[PDB]
Design a protein around this motif. Sequence first.
Motif, PDB file in Angstrom:
ATOM      1  N   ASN A  70      86.695-114.680 -39.738  1.00 46.53           N
ATOM      2  CA  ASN A  70      87.687-113.657 -39.422  1.00 46.53           C
ATOM      3  C   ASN A  70      87.575-113.160 -37.990  1.00 46.53           C
ATOM      4  O   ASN A  70      88.112-112.090 -37.676  1.00 46.53           O
ATOM      5  CB  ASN A  70      87.594-112.479 -40.398  1.00 46.53           C
ATOM      6  CG  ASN A  70      86.283-111.728 -40.284  1.00 46.53           C
ATOM      7  OD1 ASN A  70      85.420-112.063 -39.459  1.00 46.53           O
ATOM      8  ND2 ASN A  70      86.125-110.702 -41.110  1.00 46.53           N
ATOM      9  N   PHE A  71      86.883-113.912 -37.129  1.00 47.73           N
ATOM     10  CA  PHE A  71      86.795-113.678 -35.690  1.00 47.73           C
ATOM     11  C   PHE A  71      86.066-112.392 -35.339  1.00 47.73           C
ATOM     12  O   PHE A  71      86.240-111.872 -34.238  1.00 47.73           O
ATOM     13  CB  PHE A  71      88.172-113.708 -35.027  1.00 47.73           C
ATOM     14  CG  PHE A  71      88.849-115.037 -35.129  1.00 47.73           C
ATOM     15  CD1 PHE A  71      88.445-116.095 -34.327  1.00 47.73           C
ATOM     16  CD2 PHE A  71      89.858-115.248 -36.047  1.00 47.73           C
ATOM     17  CE1 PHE A  71      89.065-117.338 -34.434  1.00 47.73           C
ATOM     18  CE2 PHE A  71      90.469-116.481 -36.156  1.00 47.73           C
ATOM     19  CZ  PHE A  71      90.067-117.525 -35.349  1.00 47.73           C
ATOM     20  N   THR A  72      85.210-111.900 -36.232  1.00 45.93           N
ATOM     21  CA  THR A  72      84.242-110.865 -35.910  1.00 45.93           C
ATOM     22  C   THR A  72      82.853-111.481 -35.766  1.00 45.93           C
ATOM     23  O   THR A  72      82.629-112.651 -36.069  1.00 45.93           O
ATOM     24  CB  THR A  72      84.242-109.774 -36.989  1.00 45.93           C
ATOM     25  OG1 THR A  72      83.748-110.304 -38.216  1.00 45.93           O
ATOM     26  CG2 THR A  72      85.683-109.281 -37.237  1.00 45.93           C
ATOM     27  N   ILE A  73      81.908-110.681 -35.282  1.00 47.03           N
ATOM     28  CA  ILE A  73      80.499-111.063 -35.359  1.00 47.03           C
ATOM     29  C   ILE A  73      79.733-109.895 -35.956  1.00 47.03           C
ATOM     30  O   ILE A  73      80.125-108.732 -35.804  1.00 47.03           O
ATOM     31  CB  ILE A  73      79.911-111.464 -33.986  1.00 47.03           C
ATOM     32  CG1 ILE A  73      79.783-110.254 -33.055  1.00 47.03           C
ATOM     33  CG2 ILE A  73      80.772-112.537 -33.311  1.00 47.03           C
ATOM     34  CD1 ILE A  73      79.168-110.612 -31.691  1.00 47.03           C
ATOM     35  N   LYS A  74      78.672-110.211 -36.691  1.00 46.59           N
ATOM     36  CA  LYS A  74      77.801-109.191 -37.271  1.00 46.59           C
ATOM     37  C   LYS A  74      76.688-108.969 -36.265  1.00 46.59           C
ATOM     38  O   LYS A  74      75.629-109.598 -36.323  1.00 46.59           O
ATOM     39  CB  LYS A  74      77.257-109.618 -38.625  1.00 46.59           C
ATOM     40  CG  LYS A  74      78.336-109.846 -39.644  1.00 46.59           C
ATOM     41  CD  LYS A  74      77.699-110.105 -40.994  1.00 46.59           C
ATOM     42  CE  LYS A  74      78.713-110.613 -41.992  1.00 46.59           C
ATOM     43  NZ  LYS A  74      78.006-111.207 -43.172  1.00 46.59           N
ATOM     44  N   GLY A  75      76.945-108.075 -35.310  1.00 51.14           N
ATOM     45  CA  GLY A  75      76.015-107.806 -34.242  1.00 51.14           C
ATOM     46  C   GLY A  75      75.266-106.506 -34.463  1.00 51.14           C
ATOM     47  O   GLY A  75      75.296-105.900 -35.539  1.00 51.14           O
ATOM     48  N   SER A  76      74.566-106.091 -33.415  1.00 50.89           N
ATOM     49  CA  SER A  76      73.828-104.832 -33.384  1.00 50.89           C
ATOM     50  C   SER A  76      74.104-104.246 -32.005  1.00 50.89           C
ATOM     51  O   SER A  76      73.524-104.700 -31.015  1.00 50.89           O
ATOM     52  CB  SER A  76      72.339-105.041 -33.597  1.00 50.89           C
ATOM     53  OG  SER A  76      71.626-103.810 -33.465  1.00 50.89           O
ATOM     54  N   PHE A  77      74.993-103.259 -31.939  1.00 53.64           N
ATOM     55  CA  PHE A  77      75.488-102.770 -30.660  1.00 53.64           C
ATOM     56  C   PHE A  77      75.671-101.260 -30.736  1.00 53.64           C
ATOM     57  O   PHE A  77      76.217-100.753 -31.720  1.00 53.64           O
ATOM     58  CB  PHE A  77      76.858-103.406 -30.303  1.00 53.64           C
ATOM     59  CG  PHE A  77      76.812-104.884 -29.934  1.00 53.64           C
ATOM     60  CD1 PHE A  77      76.191-105.319 -28.770  1.00 53.64           C
ATOM     61  CD2 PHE A  77      77.464-105.822 -30.719  1.00 53.64           C
ATOM     62  CE1 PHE A  77      76.190-106.665 -28.428  1.00 53.64           C
ATOM     63  CE2 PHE A  77      77.471-107.156 -30.385  1.00 53.64           C
ATOM     64  CZ  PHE A  77      76.836-107.585 -29.237  1.00 53.64           C
ATOM     65  N   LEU A  78      75.267-100.547 -29.678  1.00 53.34           N
ATOM     66  CA  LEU A  78      75.494 -99.107 -29.595  1.00 53.34           C
ATOM     67  C   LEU A  78      76.466 -98.787 -28.466  1.00 53.34           C
ATOM     68  O   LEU A  78      76.975 -99.674 -27.773  1.00 53.34           O
ATOM     69  CB  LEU A  78      74.180 -98.364 -29.383  1.00 53.34           C
ATOM     70  CG  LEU A  78      73.096 -98.798 -30.354  1.00 53.34           C
ATOM     71  CD1 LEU A  78      71.731 -98.339 -29.849  1.00 53.34           C
ATOM     72  CD2 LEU A  78      73.426 -98.214 -31.737  1.00 53.34           C
ATOM     73  N   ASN A  79      76.746 -97.493 -28.305  1.00 50.86           N
ATOM     74  CA  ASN A  79      77.428 -97.025 -27.104  1.00 50.86           C
ATOM     75  C   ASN A  79      76.768 -97.608 -25.859  1.00 50.86           C
ATOM     76  O   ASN A  79      75.546 -97.614 -25.739  1.00 50.86           O
ATOM     77  CB  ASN A  79      77.385 -95.500 -27.044  1.00 50.86           C
ATOM     78  CG  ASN A  79      78.404 -94.863 -27.957  1.00 50.86           C
ATOM     79  OD1 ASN A  79      79.392 -95.508 -28.346  1.00 50.86           O
ATOM     80  ND2 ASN A  79      78.186 -93.591 -28.309  1.00 50.86           N
ATOM     81  N   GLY A  80      77.577 -98.113 -24.939  1.00 53.12           N
ATOM     82  CA  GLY A  80      77.050 -98.659 -23.700  1.00 53.12           C
ATOM     83  C   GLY A  80      76.690-100.131 -23.734  1.00 53.12           C
ATOM     84  O   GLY A  80      76.252-100.670 -22.707  1.00 53.12           O
ATOM     85  N   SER A  81      76.842-100.799 -24.866  1.00 50.59           N
ATOM     86  CA  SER A  81      76.458-102.211 -24.951  1.00 50.59           C
ATOM     87  C   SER A  81      77.522-103.162 -24.422  1.00 50.59           C
ATOM     88  O   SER A  81      77.254-104.361 -24.290  1.00 50.59           O
ATOM     89  CB  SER A  81      76.174-102.572 -26.411  1.00 50.59           C
ATOM     90  OG  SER A  81      77.313-102.268 -27.181  1.00 50.59           O
ATOM     91  N   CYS A  82      78.736-102.687 -24.192  1.00 52.38           N
ATOM     92  CA  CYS A  82      79.811-103.597 -23.851  1.00 52.38           C
ATOM     93  C   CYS A  82      79.516-104.275 -22.518  1.00 52.38           C
ATOM     94  O   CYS A  82      78.812-103.740 -21.666  1.00 52.38           O
ATOM     95  CB  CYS A  82      81.135-102.850 -23.815  1.00 52.38           C
ATOM     96  SG  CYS A  82      81.669-102.341 -25.480  1.00 52.38           S
ATOM     97  N   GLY A  83      80.012-105.490 -22.373  1.00 52.42           N
ATOM     98  CA  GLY A  83      79.604-106.342 -21.290  1.00 52.42           C
ATOM     99  C   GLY A  83      78.405-107.210 -21.602  1.00 52.42           C
ATOM    100  O   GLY A  83      78.138-108.148 -20.845  1.00 52.42           O
ATOM    101  N   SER A  84      77.665-106.909 -22.679  1.00 51.07           N
ATOM    102  CA  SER A  84      76.637-107.826 -23.167  1.00 51.07           C
ATOM    103  C   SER A  84      77.296-109.137 -23.560  1.00 51.07           C
ATOM    104  O   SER A  84      78.429-109.144 -24.046  1.00 51.07           O
ATOM    105  CB  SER A  84      75.906-107.261 -24.389  1.00 51.07           C
ATOM    106  OG  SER A  84      75.219-106.050 -24.095  1.00 51.07           O
ATOM    107  N   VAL A  85      76.609-110.258 -23.339  1.00 51.60           N
ATOM    108  CA  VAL A  85      77.305-111.526 -23.559  1.00 51.60           C
ATOM    109  C   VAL A  85      76.611-112.370 -24.629  1.00 51.60           C
ATOM    110  O   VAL A  85      75.427-112.206 -24.934  1.00 51.60           O
ATOM    111  CB  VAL A  85      77.479-112.335 -22.250  1.00 51.60           C
ATOM    112  CG1 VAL A  85      78.342-111.557 -21.254  1.00 51.60           C
ATOM    113  CG2 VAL A  85      76.126-112.707 -21.631  1.00 51.60           C
ATOM    114  N   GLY A  86      77.380-113.291 -25.205  1.00 51.32           N
ATOM    115  CA  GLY A  86      76.846-114.309 -26.097  1.00 51.32           C
ATOM    116  C   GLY A  86      76.917-115.674 -25.436  1.00 51.32           C
ATOM    117  O   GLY A  86      77.793-115.930 -24.610  1.00 51.32           O
ATOM    118  N   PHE A  87      75.993-116.565 -25.808  1.00 49.23           N
ATOM    119  CA  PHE A  87      75.826-117.796 -25.047  1.00 49.23           C
ATOM    120  C   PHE A  87      75.071-118.829 -25.864  1.00 49.23           C
ATOM    121  O   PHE A  87      74.335-118.507 -26.802  1.00 49.23           O
ATOM    122  CB  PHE A  87      75.069-117.563 -23.727  1.00 49.23           C
ATOM    123  CG  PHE A  87      73.671-117.023 -23.932  1.00 49.23           C
ATOM    124  CD1 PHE A  87      73.456-115.663 -24.147  1.00 49.23           C
ATOM    125  CD2 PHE A  87      72.573-117.882 -23.902  1.00 49.23           C
ATOM    126  CE1 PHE A  87      72.160-115.171 -24.346  1.00 49.23           C
ATOM    127  CE2 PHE A  87      71.273-117.400 -24.108  1.00 49.23           C
ATOM    128  CZ  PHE A  87      71.070-116.054 -24.330  1.00 49.23           C
TER     129      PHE A  87
END
Lengths: 306, 306
Positions: free
Chosen positions: B133-150
């Motif tokens: 469904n084009f989501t990921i089950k991540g672990s992210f808080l406020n300020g995490s955006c810009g973190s990348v997957g690779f």
Amino acid sequence: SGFRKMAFPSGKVEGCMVQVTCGTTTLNGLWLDDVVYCPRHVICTSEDMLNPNYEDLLIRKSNHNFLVQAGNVQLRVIGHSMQNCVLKLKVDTANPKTPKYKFVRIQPGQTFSVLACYNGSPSGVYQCAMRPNFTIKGSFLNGSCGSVGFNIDYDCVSFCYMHHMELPTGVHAGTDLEGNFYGPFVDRQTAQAAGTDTTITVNVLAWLYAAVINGDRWFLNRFTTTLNDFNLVAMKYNYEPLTQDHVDILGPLSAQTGIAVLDMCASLKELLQNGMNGRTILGSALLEDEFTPFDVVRQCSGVTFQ
Amino acid sequence: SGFRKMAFPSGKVEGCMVQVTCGTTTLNGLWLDDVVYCPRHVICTSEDMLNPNYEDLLIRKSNHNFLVQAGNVQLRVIGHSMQNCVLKLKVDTANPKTPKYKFVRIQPGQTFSVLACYNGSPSGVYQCAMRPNFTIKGSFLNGSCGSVGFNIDYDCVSFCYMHHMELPTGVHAGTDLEGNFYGPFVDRQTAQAAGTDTTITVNVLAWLYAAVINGDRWFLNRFTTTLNDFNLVAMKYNYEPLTQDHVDILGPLSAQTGIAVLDMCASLKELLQNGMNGRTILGSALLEDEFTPFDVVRQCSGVTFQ
Ligand SMILES: CC(C)(C)[C@H](NC(=O)C1(F)CC1)C(=O)N1CC2(C[C@H]1C(=O)N[C@H](C#N)C[C@@H]1CCNC1=O)SCCS2
Ligand SMILES: CC(C)(C)[C@H](NC(=O)C1(F)CC1)C(=O)N1CC2(C[C@H]1C(=O)N[C@H](C#N)C[C@@H]1CCNC1=O)SCCS2
């Protein structure tokens, strides 16, 4: 939101990994300043695995017999010695990528990341716990020895584990960076088996706190318990005794959620006695015990490293 | 032996992480050559989260309004532009740690590692899958955006994900590195919810192969199935259809174990219809679907990266 088995960033350790070869045998070494640390069984021969005479094997080696490569660059060995179960190869070049570091001996129940390496290059990174029986549930193949386990604090890498052995049932044994094994194990191919393992109670509690922080609250009951009555139930289900120090270490999570540790113990008591009835906690169908209280705070508060 | 949720070594990506600040808002950026990539919602104001006018917000910014820091070093911005949902800040300094890299758009069911970052510094690394469904089950808080997957292949980092959003129930949405979201999501604070997810059948099969390779063989039955009959059962239990391409991609694991894919499908059919009866596979009480066939081979054969 979300909760994952999260490892430390591995870059500072990647910059220390080298390859050590003696004759036909290659494993990994850890290059810090002008010393390479590696398992001494690199000097083993095809024949004497059952009980190697390490002192005699090392007497017969010269510096030039150790082939140490950092990437595609040979590091010339100018000294060698043995400290317990590790070799220390002095090289003529200090590692310019050497991080600030410490050698630490961790306690059972603590966690660390492993950078699994082959031929001095990294394969992957994962999080492990030192089990109460002094094994770790790792993922290691032929050639992985010399891979290390570590924690990071700010800018400082604390090395705590170096990989040496795989034990029956596919669990792993190794040493601190002074070459002393965790647990009763020895670096020879002989009958050894782990003692029975137990569940790390303080970590299960920390992970239940992480669940509450993430809104997964169904298992919280209305009861409390004494510390002694909880430990009587923990014992039957092969859980470690919970100590006052454990209770105090859970303080920050208890204060954040407003749930007293002994109230969480009452909810854990009910889960142990009653099962989960097909439900999951944080996506898991079993109670997880390889997150420490510190791991939970770091992940749920976004602690970073430089 | 052993099988762990294993992430890629993160060092090559760590060397690219920077901090991007506009007024009160700081998130992470990815510094490759002389360009920093970051989510465009860094230019959002406290007020217009519900539907930001990104073009008008960006028209009013100048180069100097973007504060970009690599470690403790300010990178001076000399150009800026917007590509879909990402900003591209041209800086006057090329990143000397830039790895060989590619921008890729991954398919649902594929996996990657996330280097979760705050204020341009890494917090941890973990493995994720792009859910059906084009989501990921991540672990992210406020300020995490810009973190990348690779992913990594030999020496080449394929960037596939940049983090932008958290959706209801604590799952995560983001973009490729051209700024195009995975799935129907948008970068505004509006009613969005994921479609229902499904289980990645080919990955469950790969993980059953990993179990057999590790000696955890109890679930293998004596039967076979056709591909059509298996898919009729997969459908009832909310599993993706298994395709011929999936079968062919499982070839290497099937050949290694001597178990035909359709025979493994018969064993999976029995697990779905009958449950696990309190038993575990590779230490798990649920069927795991976030290991691809390639992940299994890499972990079980010790593939490394330079
Ligand atoms: C049966 C073995 C698994 C081969 C053996 N174990 C035992 O003998 C026990 F008593 C513990 C059960 C063992 O681990 N050995 C043998 C020696 C080396 C060392 C080794 O191969 N260590 C690898 C490194 N590299 C890493 C292993 C390989 C498989 N997965 C791993 O993690 S001990 C020094 C003389 S040869
Ligand atoms: C309710 C929110 C979780 C705040 C919100 N989600 C939605 O509105 C939805 F429609 C998807 C459900 C959302 O994610 N937003 C709001 C904006 C930014 C972005 C954000 O905060 N992104 C963080 C980065 N940094 C990472 C978030 C924070 C919590 N954990 C994460 O992963 S969208 C651009 C204008 S403000």
